[PDB]
Design a protein around this ligand. Structure first.
Ligand code: MG
Ligand code: MG
Ligand code: NA
Ligand code: NA
Ligand code: NA
Ligand code: NA
Ligand code: NA
Ligand code: NA
Ligand code: NA
Ligand code: NA
Ligand code: NA
Ligand code: NA
Ligand code: NA
Ligand code: NA
Ligand code: NA
Ligand code: NA
Ligand code: NA
Ligand code: NA
Ligand code: NA
Ligand code: NA
Ligand code: PT
Ligand code: PT
Ligand code: ZN
Ligand code: ZN
Ligand code: ZN
Ligand code: ZN
Lengths: 142, 142
DNA sequence: GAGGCTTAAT
DNA sequence: TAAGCCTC
DNA sequence: GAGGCTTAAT
DNA sequence: TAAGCCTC
Protein backbone atom coordinates (compact mmCIF):
# COMPACT_ATOMS: atom_id res chain seq x y z
CA UNK A 1 0.00 0.00 0.00
CA UNK A 2 3.13 2.20 -0.27
CA UNK A 3 4.20 4.09 -3.41
CA UNK A 4 7.58 3.18 -5.01
CA UNK A 5 9.69 6.33 -5.42
CA UNK A 6 11.22 4.96 -8.65
CA UNK A 7 8.24 3.63 -10.70
CA UNK A 8 5.58 5.66 -8.78
CA UNK A 9 3.37 2.58 -8.49
CA UNK A 10 1.09 2.02 -5.52
CA UNK A 11 2.13 -1.42 -4.16
CA UNK A 12 1.78 -3.88 -1.26
CA UNK A 13 4.51 -4.63 1.29
CA UNK A 14 5.34 -7.93 -0.53
CA UNK A 15 6.54 -5.94 -3.57
CA UNK A 16 9.29 -4.39 -1.40
CA UNK A 17 12.51 -5.74 0.20
CA UNK A 18 12.93 -6.46 3.94
CA UNK A 19 16.29 -4.63 4.07
CA UNK A 20 17.18 -0.95 3.67
CA UNK A 21 16.33 -0.74 -0.09
CA UNK A 22 13.80 1.94 -1.16
CA UNK A 23 13.24 0.51 -4.68
CA UNK A 24 10.45 -2.04 -5.29
CA UNK A 25 11.36 -5.57 -6.50
CA UNK A 26 10.25 -4.70 -10.08
CA UNK A 27 12.47 -1.63 -10.25
CA UNK A 28 15.49 -3.41 -8.74
CA UNK A 29 15.00 -6.44 -11.01
CA UNK A 30 14.69 -4.16 -14.07
CA UNK A 31 17.89 -2.28 -13.07
CA UNK A 32 19.70 -5.61 -12.70
CA UNK A 33 18.35 -6.93 -16.01
CA UNK A 34 19.60 -3.77 -17.82
CA UNK A 35 23.04 -3.71 -16.19
CA UNK A 36 23.43 -7.50 -16.62
CA UNK A 37 22.47 -7.39 -20.32
CA UNK A 38 24.98 -4.63 -21.07
CA UNK A 39 27.69 -6.25 -18.94
CA UNK A 40 27.32 -9.63 -20.69
CA UNK A 41 26.69 -8.41 -24.26
CA UNK A 42 23.07 -9.57 -24.37
CA UNK A 43 20.37 -7.66 -26.20
CA UNK A 44 17.39 -6.33 -24.21
CA UNK A 45 14.12 -5.73 -26.07
CA UNK A 46 12.01 -5.20 -22.90
CA UNK A 47 11.18 -1.61 -21.99
CA UNK A 48 10.75 -0.85 -18.29
CA UNK A 49 6.93 -0.58 -18.75
CA UNK A 50 6.62 -3.91 -20.58
CA UNK A 51 8.97 -5.56 -18.06
CA UNK A 52 6.91 -4.33 -15.10
CA UNK A 53 3.71 -5.70 -16.66
CA UNK A 54 5.52 -8.95 -17.48
CA UNK A 55 6.98 -9.21 -13.96
CA UNK A 56 3.58 -8.75 -12.33
CA UNK A 57 3.26 -8.96 -8.58
CA UNK A 58 4.96 -11.02 -5.88
CA UNK A 59 2.07 -13.32 -4.94
CA UNK A 60 1.65 -14.37 -8.57
CA UNK A 61 5.35 -15.07 -9.22
CA UNK A 62 6.49 -18.72 -9.35
CA UNK A 63 9.63 -20.16 -10.89
CA UNK A 64 8.82 -21.50 -14.37
CA UNK A 65 11.01 -24.59 -13.83
CA UNK A 66 10.47 -25.79 -10.24
CA UNK A 67 7.20 -23.98 -9.45
CA UNK A 68 8.45 -22.49 -6.20
CA UNK A 69 6.59 -19.30 -5.18
CA UNK A 70 8.50 -16.09 -4.52
CA UNK A 71 7.64 -16.41 -0.79
CA UNK A 72 8.76 -20.07 -0.83
CA UNK A 73 12.08 -19.12 -2.38
CA UNK A 74 12.52 -16.26 0.08
CA UNK A 75 12.10 -18.83 2.91
CA UNK A 76 15.12 -20.73 1.58
CA UNK A 77 17.33 -17.79 2.64
CA UNK A 78 19.60 -18.02 -0.37
CA UNK A 79 22.23 -15.30 -0.71
CA UNK A 80 23.18 -13.27 -3.77
CA UNK A 81 26.81 -12.65 -4.86
CA UNK A 82 27.10 -9.54 -2.63
CA UNK A 83 25.92 -11.66 0.32
CA UNK A 84 22.30 -10.51 0.77
CA UNK A 85 19.12 -12.55 1.29
CA UNK A 86 17.36 -13.10 -2.09
CA UNK A 87 13.69 -12.09 -1.88
CA UNK A 88 12.53 -12.13 -5.47
CA UNK A 89 12.53 -14.35 -8.55
CA UNK A 90 14.71 -13.54 -11.52
CA UNK A 91 14.67 -13.89 -15.28
CA UNK A 92 15.99 -16.81 -17.38
CA UNK A 93 16.94 -16.23 -21.01
CA UNK A 94 15.34 -19.51 -22.18
CA UNK A 95 17.69 -19.84 -25.10
CA UNK A 96 20.93 -18.93 -23.38
CA UNK A 97 22.35 -17.83 -26.72
CA UNK A 98 19.56 -15.21 -27.03
CA UNK A 99 19.10 -11.99 -25.05
CA UNK A 100 16.37 -10.65 -22.76
CA UNK A 101 13.02 -10.33 -24.54
CA UNK A 102 9.33 -11.05 -23.88
CA UNK A 103 9.60 -14.10 -26.17
CA UNK A 104 12.84 -15.44 -24.61
CA UNK A 105 12.16 -14.58 -20.96
CA UNK A 106 11.06 -17.10 -18.40
CA UNK A 107 10.69 -16.39 -14.67
CA UNK A 108 13.19 -18.45 -12.71
CA UNK A 109 14.39 -18.71 -9.10
CA UNK A 110 18.13 -18.19 -8.67
CA UNK A 111 18.64 -21.89 -7.86
CA UNK A 112 17.14 -23.09 -11.18
CA UNK A 113 18.71 -20.21 -13.11
CA UNK A 114 22.22 -21.22 -11.92
CA UNK A 115 21.54 -24.93 -12.44
CA UNK A 116 20.37 -24.45 -16.02
CA UNK A 117 23.40 -22.14 -16.53
CA UNK A 118 24.28 -22.48 -20.23
CA UNK A 119 24.33 -26.27 -19.96
CA UNK A 120 20.67 -27.33 -20.33
CA UNK A 121 17.93 -26.35 -22.78
CA UNK A 122 14.65 -25.01 -21.41
CA UNK A 123 13.13 -28.37 -22.37
CA UNK A 124 15.87 -30.28 -20.49
CA UNK A 125 15.48 -27.85 -17.58
CA UNK A 126 11.70 -28.41 -17.47
CA UNK A 127 12.63 -31.98 -16.51
CA UNK A 128 15.22 -30.95 -13.86
CA UNK A 129 12.60 -28.49 -12.54
CA UNK A 130 10.11 -31.28 -11.73
CA UNK A 131 12.89 -33.04 -9.77
CA UNK A 132 13.73 -29.82 -7.91
CA UNK A 133 9.98 -29.28 -7.21
CA UNK A 134 9.98 -32.73 -5.50
CA UNK A 135 12.82 -31.58 -3.21
CA UNK A 136 10.79 -28.49 -2.22
CA UNK A 137 7.52 -30.43 -1.75
CA UNK A 138 9.58 -32.91 0.29
CA UNK A 139 10.74 -30.06 2.55
CA UNK A 140 7.17 -28.70 2.91
CA UNK A 141 7.76 -25.67 0.64
CA UNK A 142 5.35 -24.39 -2.05
CA UNK B 1 49.80 -49.98 -20.94
CA UNK B 2 52.10 -47.16 -19.74
CA UNK B 3 53.45 -46.81 -16.19
CA UNK B 4 52.47 -43.68 -14.18
CA UNK B 5 55.63 -41.96 -12.86
CA UNK B 6 53.79 -40.89 -9.69
CA UNK B 7 51.93 -44.03 -8.46
CA UNK B 8 54.11 -46.50 -10.46
CA UNK B 9 50.99 -48.34 -11.67
CA UNK B 10 50.85 -50.02 -15.06
CA UNK B 11 47.78 -48.46 -16.76
CA UNK B 12 45.87 -48.08 -20.05
CA UNK B 13 45.77 -44.91 -22.14
CA UNK B 14 42.25 -44.09 -20.79
CA UNK B 15 43.72 -43.62 -17.29
CA UNK B 16 45.81 -40.69 -18.63
CA UNK B 17 44.97 -37.14 -19.83
CA UNK B 18 44.97 -36.03 -23.49
CA UNK B 19 47.00 -32.88 -22.70
CA UNK B 20 50.59 -32.41 -21.53
CA UNK B 21 50.06 -33.90 -18.01
CA UNK B 22 52.34 -36.81 -16.99
CA UNK B 23 50.26 -37.82 -13.91
CA UNK B 24 47.48 -40.43 -14.26
CA UNK B 25 43.85 -39.41 -13.51
CA UNK B 26 43.99 -41.18 -10.10
CA UNK B 27 47.10 -39.32 -9.02
CA UNK B 28 45.82 -35.93 -10.23
CA UNK B 29 42.40 -36.51 -8.63
CA UNK B 30 44.07 -37.55 -5.34
CA UNK B 31 46.28 -34.41 -5.41
CA UNK B 32 43.19 -32.26 -5.99
CA UNK B 33 41.22 -34.02 -3.26
CA UNK B 34 44.06 -33.40 -0.74
CA UNK B 35 44.63 -29.75 -1.69
CA UNK B 36 40.86 -29.08 -1.84
CA UNK B 37 40.24 -30.66 1.59
CA UNK B 38 42.96 -28.58 3.24
CA UNK B 39 41.92 -25.41 1.40
CA UNK B 40 38.26 -25.75 2.46
CA UNK B 41 38.78 -27.09 6.01
CA UNK B 42 37.39 -30.55 5.25
CA UNK B 43 38.77 -33.68 6.86
CA UNK B 44 40.26 -36.39 4.61
CA UNK B 45 40.31 -39.97 5.93
CA UNK B 46 41.27 -41.56 2.55
CA UNK B 47 44.91 -42.56 2.13
CA UNK B 48 46.31 -42.43 -1.41
CA UNK B 49 46.25 -46.27 -1.61
CA UNK B 50 42.63 -46.58 -0.45
CA UNK B 51 41.62 -43.70 -2.74
CA UNK B 52 43.23 -45.34 -5.79
CA UNK B 53 41.41 -48.61 -5.08
CA UNK B 54 38.18 -46.68 -4.51
CA UNK B 55 38.66 -44.62 -7.70
CA UNK B 56 39.19 -47.73 -9.81
CA UNK B 57 39.65 -47.39 -13.54
CA UNK B 58 38.22 -45.09 -16.19
CA UNK B 59 35.96 -47.55 -18.01
CA UNK B 60 34.24 -48.47 -14.75
CA UNK B 61 33.67 -44.89 -13.57
CA UNK B 62 30.12 -43.45 -13.85
CA UNK B 63 28.63 -40.49 -12.03
CA UNK B 64 26.63 -41.75 -9.03
CA UNK B 65 23.83 -39.23 -9.68
CA UNK B 66 23.27 -39.04 -13.45
CA UNK B 67 24.99 -42.28 -14.51
CA UNK B 68 27.12 -40.65 -17.18
CA UNK B 69 30.33 -42.59 -17.97
CA UNK B 70 33.71 -40.91 -17.72
CA UNK B 71 34.02 -41.09 -21.55
CA UNK B 72 30.49 -39.67 -21.92
CA UNK B 73 31.34 -36.76 -19.65
CA UNK B 74 34.63 -36.17 -21.48
CA UNK B 75 32.59 -35.87 -24.72
CA UNK B 76 30.67 -32.96 -23.21
CA UNK B 77 33.89 -30.89 -23.34
CA UNK B 78 33.25 -29.14 -20.05
CA UNK B 79 36.02 -26.87 -18.78
CA UNK B 80 37.51 -26.64 -15.30
CA UNK B 81 38.15 -23.31 -13.49
CA UNK B 82 41.62 -22.95 -15.07
CA UNK B 83 40.00 -23.41 -18.50
CA UNK B 84 41.00 -26.99 -19.40
CA UNK B 85 38.90 -29.84 -20.82
CA UNK B 86 37.63 -32.08 -17.96
CA UNK B 87 38.43 -35.74 -18.66
CA UNK B 88 37.67 -37.48 -15.41
CA UNK B 89 34.93 -37.80 -12.79
CA UNK B 90 35.32 -36.22 -9.38
CA UNK B 91 34.29 -36.87 -5.81
CA UNK B 92 31.12 -35.66 -4.02
CA UNK B 93 31.09 -35.38 -0.23
CA UNK B 94 27.56 -36.85 0.06
CA UNK B 95 26.86 -35.01 3.25
CA UNK B 96 28.25 -31.62 2.33
CA UNK B 97 28.82 -30.89 6.01
CA UNK B 98 31.16 -33.92 6.25
CA UNK B 99 34.65 -34.34 4.79
CA UNK B 100 36.21 -36.76 2.30
CA UNK B 101 36.00 -40.37 3.47
CA UNK B 102 35.19 -43.82 2.04
CA UNK B 103 31.80 -43.65 3.79
CA UNK B 104 30.96 -40.08 2.65
CA UNK B 105 32.43 -40.22 -0.87
CA UNK B 106 30.35 -40.64 -3.98
CA UNK B 107 31.71 -40.44 -7.54
CA UNK B 108 30.19 -37.46 -9.33
CA UNK B 109 30.67 -35.66 -12.65
CA UNK B 110 31.49 -31.96 -12.30
CA UNK B 111 28.03 -30.99 -13.62
CA UNK B 112 26.17 -32.90 -10.88
CA UNK B 113 28.73 -31.95 -8.24
CA UNK B 114 28.17 -28.21 -8.92
CA UNK B 115 24.39 -28.63 -9.16
CA UNK B 116 24.14 -30.42 -5.83
CA UNK B 117 26.50 -27.75 -4.40
CA UNK B 118 25.55 -27.47 -0.70
CA UNK B 119 21.88 -27.03 -1.59
CA UNK B 120 20.55 -30.58 -2.08
CA UNK B 121 20.90 -33.78 -0.04
CA UNK B 122 22.27 -36.89 -1.74
CA UNK B 123 18.69 -38.23 -1.65
CA UNK B 124 17.34 -35.05 -3.30
CA UNK B 125 20.22 -35.17 -5.78
CA UNK B 126 19.46 -38.81 -6.67
CA UNK B 127 16.19 -37.40 -8.02
CA UNK B 128 17.84 -34.51 -9.95
CA UNK B 129 20.34 -37.08 -11.29
CA UNK B 130 17.59 -39.13 -13.00
CA UNK B 131 16.39 -35.91 -14.69
CA UNK B 132 19.94 -35.08 -15.79
CA UNK B 133 20.37 -38.69 -17.06
CA UNK B 134 17.29 -38.08 -19.30
CA UNK B 135 19.01 -35.01 -20.81
CA UNK B 136 22.10 -37.13 -21.62
CA UNK B 137 20.08 -40.07 -23.00
CA UNK B 138 18.14 -37.48 -25.01
CA UNK B 139 21.43 -36.23 -26.51
CA UNK B 140 22.61 -39.80 -27.28
CA UNK B 141 25.20 -39.88 -24.46
CA UNK B 142 25.82 -42.82 -22.08
C1' DG C 1 59.74 -35.71 -10.13
C1' DA C 2 56.53 -32.60 -6.43
C1' DG C 3 52.93 -29.81 -5.84
C1' DG C 4 50.79 -24.52 -5.56
C1' DC C 5 47.75 -22.45 -8.26
C1' DT C 6 42.20 -19.96 -9.91
C1' DT C 7 37.59 -20.19 -9.70
C1' DA C 8 31.34 -21.68 -15.26
C1' DA C 9 27.59 -19.17 -16.34
C1' DT C 10 24.15 -17.88 -14.17
C1' DT D 1 35.86 -28.54 -7.70
C1' DA D 2 40.02 -29.92 -11.70
C1' DA D 3 44.26 -30.30 -15.64
C1' DG D 4 47.82 -28.16 -17.14
C1' DC D 5 51.80 -24.61 -16.17
C1' DC D 6 55.39 -23.04 -13.83
C1' DT D 7 58.57 -22.66 -10.10
C1' DC D 8 61.05 -25.50 -7.37
C1' DG E 1 16.58 10.25 -6.27
C1' DA E 2 20.11 7.44 -9.91
C1' DG E 3 22.73 3.74 -10.67
C1' DG E 4 27.84 1.20 -10.45
C1' DC E 5 29.19 -2.43 -8.03
C1' DT E 6 31.00 -8.38 -7.02
C1' DT E 7 30.53 -12.85 -8.10
C1' DA E 8 27.67 -19.78 -4.11
C1' DA E 9 29.71 -23.88 -3.31
C1' DT E 10 31.16 -27.01 -5.83
C1' DT F 1 22.60 -13.44 -11.76
C1' DA F 2 20.76 -9.90 -7.36
C1' DA F 3 19.94 -6.37 -2.84
C1' DG F 4 21.99 -3.33 -0.38
C1' DC F 5 25.89 0.42 0.01
C1' DC F 6 28.07 4.18 -1.34
C1' DT F 7 29.32 7.90 -4.32
C1' DC F 8 27.18 11.06 -6.99
MG1 MG G 1 19.40 -18.21 -17.39
MG1 MG H 1 29.96 -32.18 -3.63
NA1 NA I 1 -0.15 -6.44 -3.67
NA1 NA J 1 17.62 -9.88 -13.60
NA1 NA K 1 14.75 -0.83 -26.44
NA1 NA L 1 4.49 -16.89 -12.46
NA1 NA M 1 22.49 -19.69 2.03
NA1 NA N 1 19.48 -14.41 4.95
NA1 NA O 1 11.79 -35.17 -13.81
NA1 NA P 1 12.93 -35.22 -1.38
NA1 NA Q 1 42.81 -50.14 -18.50
NA1 NA R 1 38.71 -34.06 -6.23
NA1 NA S 1 45.08 -39.87 7.22
NA1 NA T 1 31.24 -46.10 -10.89
NA1 NA U 1 32.22 -25.74 -22.13
NA1 NA V 1 37.75 -28.70 -24.62
NA1 NA W 1 13.50 -37.48 -11.33
NA1 NA X 1 15.78 -34.26 -23.17
NA1 NA Y 1 32.92 -15.74 -14.48
NA1 NA Z 1 33.75 -18.65 -3.57
PT1 PT a 1 18.08 -1.87 -5.16
PT1 PT b 1 48.14 -32.93 -12.97
ZN1 ZN c 1 9.26 0.50 -8.35
ZN1 ZN d 1 13.25 -22.84 -9.47
ZN1 ZN e 1 49.35 -42.34 -11.08
ZN1 ZN f 1 26.48 -36.45 -13.20
Amino acid sequence: MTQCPRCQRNLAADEFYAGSSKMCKGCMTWQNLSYNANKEGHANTFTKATFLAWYGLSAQRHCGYCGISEAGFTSLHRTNPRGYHIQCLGVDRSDSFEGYSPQNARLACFICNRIKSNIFSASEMDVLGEAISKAWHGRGIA
